[PDB]
Amino acid sequence: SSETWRFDDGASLSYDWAAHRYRVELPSGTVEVRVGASEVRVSDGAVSLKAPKISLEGPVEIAGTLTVSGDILGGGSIIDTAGNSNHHTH
Amino acid sequence: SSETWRFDDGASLSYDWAAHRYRVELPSGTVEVRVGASEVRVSDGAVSLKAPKISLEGPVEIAGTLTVSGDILGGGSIIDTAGNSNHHTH
Amino acid sequence: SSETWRFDDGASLSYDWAAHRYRVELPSGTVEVRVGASEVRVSDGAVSLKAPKISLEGPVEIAGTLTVSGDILGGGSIIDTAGNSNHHTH
Ligand SMILES: [Fe+3]
Numbered sequence: 459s460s461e462t463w464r465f466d467d468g469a470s471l472s473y474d475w476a477a478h479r480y481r482v483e484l485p486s487g488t489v490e491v492r493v494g495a496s497e498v499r500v501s502d503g504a505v506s507l508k509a510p511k512i513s514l515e516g517p518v519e520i521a522g523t524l525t526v527s528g529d530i531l532g533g534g535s536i537i538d539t540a541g542n543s544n545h546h547t548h
Numbered sequence: 549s550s551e552t553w554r555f556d557d558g559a560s561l562s563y564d565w566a567a568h569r570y571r572v573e574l575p576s577g578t579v580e581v582r583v584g585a586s587e588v589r590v591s592d593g594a595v596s597l598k599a600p601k602i603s604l605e606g607p608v609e610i611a612g613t614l615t616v617s618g619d620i621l622g623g624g625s626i627i628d629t630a631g632n633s634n635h636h637t638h
Numbered sequence: 639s640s641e642t643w644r645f646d647d648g649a650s651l652s653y654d655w656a657a658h659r660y661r662v663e664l665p666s667g668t669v670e671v672r673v674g675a676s677e678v679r680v681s682d683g684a685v686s687l688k689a690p691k692i693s694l695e696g697p698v699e700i701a702g703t704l705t706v707s708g709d710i711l712g713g714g715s716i717i718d719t720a721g722n723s724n725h726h727t728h
Contacts, residue, residue, distance in 0.1 A: 467658065478557065478577025486584050487658025494666050494682030502584030505597045505696075507685045508605040512702075515611045515688040516595075521695045522602075523618035523714070528703035529625045530718075534613070535709045536628040538620075538716040544636040546724040568647065568667025576674050592674030595687045598695040605701045606685075612692075613708035619715045624703070626718040628710075634726040 460474035472481045482489075488501040496509035530536075550564035562571045572579075578591040586599035620626075640654035652661045662669075668681040676689035710716075 467655075475557075478574060479580070480574075480578070481580045481582065483582040484584070484658060484660075488660070489581060489583055490659070490661045491669060491680055492661065492663040493669055493680045494664070496680050496682060496685050498588070498678070498680055498685055500581055500583045500586050500588055500599075502586060503599070504601040504603050505586050505588055505599040506603040506605065508603075509680075509683070509685040510606060511684040512604050512606045512608045513611070513684050513686040513688075514608065514692050515686065516690060516692045517612045518610050518614045518692045518694065520614070520616040520618070520698050521693070522616075522697045523621065524616045524698045524700070525621045525623075526700040526702075526704045527623045528700070529627070529720075530620070530622045530710070531703065531705045532626075532628045532710045533705075533707045534629055535631040536626060536633075536712075536716060536723075537631070537709070538633050538635055538712045539714055540619075541635045541715040541717070542633050543626075543716075543718050543722050544638055545718055545721045548638065548724055548728065565647075568664060569670070570664075570668070571670045571672065573672040574674070579671060579673055588678070590671055590673045590676050590678055590689075592676060593689070594691040594693050595676050595678055595689040596693040596695065598693075600696060602694050602696045602698045603701070604698065607702045608700050608704045610704070610706040610708070612706075613711065614706045615711045615713075617713045619717070620710070620712045622716075622718045624719055625721040626716060626723075627721070628723050628725055630709075631725045632723050633716075634728055638728065 459476040462472040464470045469484045490499040499506040549566040552562040554560045559574045580589040589596040639656040642652040644650045649664045670679040679686040
């Protein structure tokens with residue numbers, strides 16, 4: 459169903475024609491693509507996106523906790539399940 | 549302005565020197581880059597980032613609805629347009 | 639510690655075996671990967687993800703301000719530091 463090439467570095471490339479799935483895998487290290495001042499980096503510890511604007515076009519689902527250093531501005535409702543702040547007055 | 553290579557799989561590579569734009573395109577399937585336990589995957593149904601930390605460095609603009617399974621913690625204001633919860637007490 | 643290849647376009651590829659770090663760099667332009675209707679694009683002005691679903695699996699840390707055009711739905715608490723709306727009633 460698939461084939462794999464293993465490189466001298468331990469990295470591999472695999473291609474499953476029964477899925478059209480291409481996989482590049484490194485056991486450890488960092489892969490980075492930079493264009494101007496924008497970067498996508500994939501490393502053992504993180505996936506990092508850095509750019510003048512990071513645009514996510516579609517429904518976004520975070521499986522985890524979201525921490526934002528700056529403000530959070532929503533064009534609709536902002537609805538919790540377990541608690542929000544009383545940092546406002548009626 | 550550009551040139552294109554079409555592969556036997558239906559995939560293509562194109563390069564516009566009048567924009568310095570490189571495009572790799574697959575009609576269907578999955579492309580994945582894995583480094584350690586971190587992954588970026590692009591498939592017909594999703595773009596998926598999986599990592600011990602997902603770092604977005606810059607202004608983030610979501611064109612869509614954001615769902616977070618865990619908590620949302622903001623270092624500044626969290627301001628809606630259309631409604632927030634009363635899950636707090638004055 | 640590393641080696642670099644510089645292309646006729648000003649782009650470069652570098653590999654540090656003392657880090658297993660691969661870097662592709664373009665001074666200016668756009669690099670795009672498309673699979674079906676999903677895309678990851680890296681350009682001078684932005685990193686853009688577009689897909690039927692954008693899945694972020696792990697803790698997400700935004701260093702910047704987050705703007706969401708649609709709703710924000712949290713499965714836990716949503717806690718600010720500096721202010722939230724009074725768009726609700728007790
Ligand atoms: Fe209140």
